[PDB]
Design a protein around this ligand. Sequence first.
Ligand SMILES: CCCCCCCCCCCCCCCCCC(=O)OC[C@H](COP(=O)(O)OCCN)OC(=O)CCCCCCCCCCCCCCCCC
Ligand SMILES: Nc1ncnc2c1ncn2[C@@H]1O[C@H](COP(=O)(O)O)[C@@H](O)[C@H]1O
Lengths: 60, 120, 320, 175, 55, 98, 49, 48, 347, 110
Amino acid sequence: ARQWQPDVEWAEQYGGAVMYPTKETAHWKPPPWNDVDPPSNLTLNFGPQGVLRLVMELSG
Amino acid sequence: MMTGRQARAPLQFLPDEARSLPPPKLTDPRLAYIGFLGYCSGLIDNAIRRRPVLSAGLHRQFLYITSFVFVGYYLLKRQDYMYAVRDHDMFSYIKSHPEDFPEKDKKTYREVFEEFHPVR
Amino acid sequence: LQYGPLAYILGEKTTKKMTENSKLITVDGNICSGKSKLAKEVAEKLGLKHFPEAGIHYADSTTGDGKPLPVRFSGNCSLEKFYDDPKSNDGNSYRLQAWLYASRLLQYADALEHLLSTGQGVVLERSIYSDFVFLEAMYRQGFIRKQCVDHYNQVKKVTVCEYLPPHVVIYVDVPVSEVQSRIQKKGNPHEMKITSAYLQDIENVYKGTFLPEMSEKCEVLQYSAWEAEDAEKVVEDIQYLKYDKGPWLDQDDRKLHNLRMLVQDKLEVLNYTSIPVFLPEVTIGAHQSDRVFQEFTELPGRKYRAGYNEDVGDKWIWLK
Amino acid sequence: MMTYIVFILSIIFVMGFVGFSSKPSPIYGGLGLIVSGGVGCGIVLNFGGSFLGLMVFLIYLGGMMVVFGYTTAMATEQYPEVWVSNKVVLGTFITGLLMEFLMVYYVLKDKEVEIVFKFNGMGDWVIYDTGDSGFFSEEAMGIAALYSYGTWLVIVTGWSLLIGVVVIMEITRGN
Amino acid sequence: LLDLIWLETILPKTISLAQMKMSTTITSQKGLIKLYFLSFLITILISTTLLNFHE
Amino acid sequence: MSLVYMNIMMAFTVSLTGLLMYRSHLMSSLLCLEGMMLSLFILATLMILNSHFTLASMMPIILLVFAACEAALGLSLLVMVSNTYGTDYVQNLNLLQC
Amino acid sequence: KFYIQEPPHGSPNWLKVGLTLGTSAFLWIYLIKQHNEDVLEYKRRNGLE
Amino acid sequence: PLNYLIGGCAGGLTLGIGAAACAYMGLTAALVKMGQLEGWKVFAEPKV
Amino acid sequence: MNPIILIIILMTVMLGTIIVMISTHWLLIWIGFEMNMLAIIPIMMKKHNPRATEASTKYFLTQSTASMLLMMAIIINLMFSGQWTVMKLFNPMASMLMTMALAMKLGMAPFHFWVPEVTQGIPLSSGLILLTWQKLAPMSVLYQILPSINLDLILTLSILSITIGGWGGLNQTQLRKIMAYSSIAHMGWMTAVLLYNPTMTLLNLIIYIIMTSTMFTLFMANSTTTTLSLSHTWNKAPIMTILVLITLLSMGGLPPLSGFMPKWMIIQEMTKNDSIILPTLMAITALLNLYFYMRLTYSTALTMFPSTNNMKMKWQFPTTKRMTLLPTMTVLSTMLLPLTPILSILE
Amino acid sequence: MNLMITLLTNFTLATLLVTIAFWLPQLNVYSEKTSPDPMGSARLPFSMKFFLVAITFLLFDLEIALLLPLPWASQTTNLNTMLTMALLLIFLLAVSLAYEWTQKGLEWTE
Ligand SMILES: CCCCCCCCCCCCCCCCCC(=O)OC[C@H](COP(=O)(O)OCCN)OC(=O)CCCCCCCCCCCCCCCCC
Ligand SMILES: Nc1ncnc2c1ncn2[C@@H]1O[C@H](COP(=O)(O)O)[C@@H](O)[C@H]1O
């Protein structure tokens, strides 16, 4: 009645990974907002090769 | 185009021969337009940092105007110099090749026949 | 700014002020655990700057004249209306929770900025690391929807990864019976409408989800209702810790310079709180946002940048 | 036969890149590039470029391809291959390399001599010993002039190597 | 019929249909670096042999 | 033109075609790129020694040093890729499609 | 006072304002001197006196 | 020009979408014919 | 990153471009490109996330291939000329290789396939450097070798760059990929007028860098990376709302704005040389750029507005960000058209 | 020529000793043995430190490649420039070493 300012359905169709969702572009999710993406150590067995076995959680 | 002219004396913003040309007046409309661009940059600078646009930073607006006029004066000097070099090279090449630039015999319209196309 | 990369060049290194007392300590507990006195007690024993709990009007207290603004400009949400109807139509639950998450994010930014600009430690009450424990406890009560939990996890995933965990997490064990005893003895007529299972789910997400994941990234100190009454035992537990876990140990001047440049830029701290993920509890239309913004501009001291308001008595404006 | 030797090495050089531009593995790719570096170094050394050939060995092969094999060996998780007794573990290697030299000798056929004999270089190509030079390798003194004449070149090269150290230490940090 | 359909079909909408089909055949790249350098080599083998741009 | 120069150019184009058709790995790309650098070294060296142009003899070493430093940079990039995915596969490098 | 925290621009930075006005006045007086020297050089090279 | 307009529409009927490709290829072949007549240069030599 | 190391690396980027700009020798051209790439690789990895490593890997591969093709062109020039002056090339094979290599360094189509990726992977200031400062050195080499550049090849690359940078801007909500396809289209515009008047090449370059720098400075001032995130600018900083969009109305090429200054002048130099069809087609494709970028303008100044409630908190904090030269660059990217004959300073 | 003959003879003696070392105990019909170490089925974790010392080798090896023509450059006429550039290259190698020092690059293999 006053001046047309949108529905939210108009704003949601200017989002996503692509403007126009085609068949190959429908599964493309949008990238993260801060542009970062969600991404152990070595374990040796010094065996009997006195005598002693050593299980080593080594970190480099 | 004219890079062979600025190849025997490189990186000269204003050559010495540019001093043989009249400088722009300080009431140049182009220079006053560049000062208007300085005033616009001052108003946009006070607008984008949420300052009172006409009131705040009068020294800052004065330096915007002064800096644009200061750079624009030398830009107008270099503009006038480059178009003077363009016309000087044009006139020297016209004078040095008369056979490539003949004087066309100007015929009056009492000799020139034009096909009349009636409009009806 | 006042602090920048040139200050880092000219020698203002923020490990020079990092002493053994420079500790960020977050006191956590249930709704009426009575920890609000205890944290203040720590602030008068360790010499730390106490920050109170971030309510609706924290950002109002940090800026302007420091007074709380009217609710339409700050929050557009009420704590007492959540106490009255948690399952309300207009969605005051997630709207109040998201505004509290943004207020606690500004509190945590002020905490790290004080700790890195002074070298004086900060005692916080219910920081951003202990905020989802209300949200989950709301979602276990049906007070919000699953899409609200998705929106909050999005905001938390893009905001909490930029920061460090606190040094000491002081947790208070108070069971649901004594919590209800203190709520009924408190006298707030709205707060007494809190159900039992909501407090139980707060305590469950405290004990089963919050504290085990805080146990790897920092050191927690856990107290009951009566041994948290003594401040000296808490301070003796804090001072005789051996800080050995967490990413505070591999912090040189470069990482802490990046963090201090991050937290002083308040719009970069509060950037991803208002991501354009359209959820009906937080989505405001164009006419309402326009009207509230134009009413915000005519508030005293809010028309310009802070040193530039003639209505509140700013001089020398034509030379600034 | 002996005259065309540089040309022969160049043919092997081309075949060497077909060893690894078809890309059987990064490890066999490094092996083929090492063999190609050796034969291209032979091409360089047979024009009197002794210092430049030793820069191929010392800096390209022994300096950089060591690092390529080192970084490759810190990736591309290995798996065993055929390990029967000596009729497979070395006999197939010798028959395969004999077929490789068979392929080297096999390309010098009638489609090659129409290019070799119509455009005979050996007889008039290798002209580095055209007259006398004196008591000095001209190539050695040209490399020696890097310090007297190449002041700007050494400045921008050493600055690029210092910036290379700084750039590697900044991007390989993760923080 | 003529303005709301046909002259609305030929001038503003079948041309925009052509541009959106051409862009969705352009902007549908999978991001594979293999296919990008494969298209670069398609460029090299078209231009260096057939198109004769080295002459 | 000449013959052995045509051979070194043939090697350059063969390693270019290997550099323009990726199979599996990023190390294969860096190896084809450094085979290209090797062929540039060989061809520059044969030209500079052929003409007896003395001052350019420092040029292939320059052409080595920078480009070898370039290869070092490439190796470091590969390593960071192999610290994110565990492999140096080029098909893990496809997050920038959107 | 009105503000709960001191703004970075509550007071005029007199060093910055002084350098601003001094640099602007320097550009004005140097511009005027350059224009006077240019019109003198023009009248000396082309003889308009 | 008209004959290559017919040829462009003939290439457009074997393209499909039909009438649009008819008109587009007809106008394009018309421009090819008019470039052959009036000497229109697409990759024009730099002359001034 | 250590700020002293940042200053050293940025001066090394500037030093590599300056070494390409001032050198009379081909080895120093190649050295300056190598120095420029080697120094700009940590600028992309300022944030240390996997998208920056992917972007830097793609950038390294493309720029390294272009550097080796440049050195092959230099080597073939030393065959057929025996010399090293940065001047015209003395073999059209070396001319074609150097034109292809400089088109790869600029990201001109069909070597454009790295430009929207890498600009997506990196921050806004590094994308600003990649789309403004990294154009200056290959355009300088193209300025210095234009008596050998093949006409048909540079026009093919120019119109293919303008068409692909046009049809790349449809399907995008990312601001950085839209700036990348605008980059590709404008490089087609610059290399269209190169063999006719390279002063208009430098005019188009300077106006493009001013408009791109204004747009990236606005994107850094608002910290918005997508169209949908740009759509909240009207409620946070309303003065930021229109300046982005009058600058983008300039970037389309639209009078009376100064972004109409390059393209018109380019047409003004191509109708002199009797090419009427080619600037007509290229500027129809520029109208297609106006089509998609005007749709983005409708997105921000109009329909898709609505806000979220946390924006109310951002009203209590001004921008403490350095908006360096942003009023100056916003005035210089719109109101420069009445000073259009200033272009004679670029001769 | 003599060098190629010498390399070929060294390669032939090497391949002959390897061939004798493989084929002489494979005369034996000893036993075909079965049933195939500190890891059994573990993958290789990457180590950043080994790659840092490899790239440090490569960059200082390039700086050594620049330093190699010094016994020839001592014979030049412009000895002041030659001495300045020699000291400048070794000083830049030392500055690269000091930057490798202070940014903890030489740690846990110091
Ligand atoms: C014939 C002509 C010859 C050539 C003429 C000259 C050509 C100049 C081309 C300029 C290209 C500049 C590219 C950007 C500057 C380079 C360094 C840089 O990126 O500085 C920006 C700086 C980075 O700060 P940072 O902390 O990294 O911000 C990211 C968020 N943390 O800070 C920021 O991000 C703050 C935000 C504002 C940055 C604005 C920078 C604008 C610089 C360009 C001005 C316009 C171009 C010069 C004038 C016209 C000439 C073309
Ligand atoms: N989900 C929630 N429900 C009720 N109160 C909450 C919630 N999340 C945070 N709070 C805050 O926690 C406070 C209770 O702590 P206290 O000040 O100790 O009574 C309330 O006044 C709210 O400001």
